[PDB]
Amino acid sequence: VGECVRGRCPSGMCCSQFGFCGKGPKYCGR
């Protein structure tokens, strides 16, 4: 859960190096 479409997620998240998403360090650089 929280997995990107291999680079993106819904309107506001950023995506990680496993392709999970959020607005924390490894998701958005912060």
Ligand X SMILES: CC(=O)N[C@@H]1[C@@H](O)[C@H](O[C@@H]2O[C@H](CO)[C@@H](O[C@@H]3O[C@H](CO)[C@@H](O)[C@H](O)[C@H]3NC(C)=O)[C@H](O)[C@H]2NC(C)=O)[C@@H](CO)O[C@H]1O
Query: Whose Cβ is closer to ligand X: residue 11's or residue 17's?
Result: 17
Alpha-carbon gap, residue 28 to 7, rounded angstroms: 12
Distance, in Å, from the CA atom of 27 to the CA atom of 11, rounded to the nearest integer, reads 14
CB closer to ligand X, 2 vs 5: 2
In the complex, which residue's CB is closest to ligand X?
16
Beta bridge partners of 22: 14
3-state secondary structure of 26: helix
| Smaller CB separation from ligand X, 11 or 23 | 23
Closest approach of ligand X to the CB of residue 21, in Å:
8
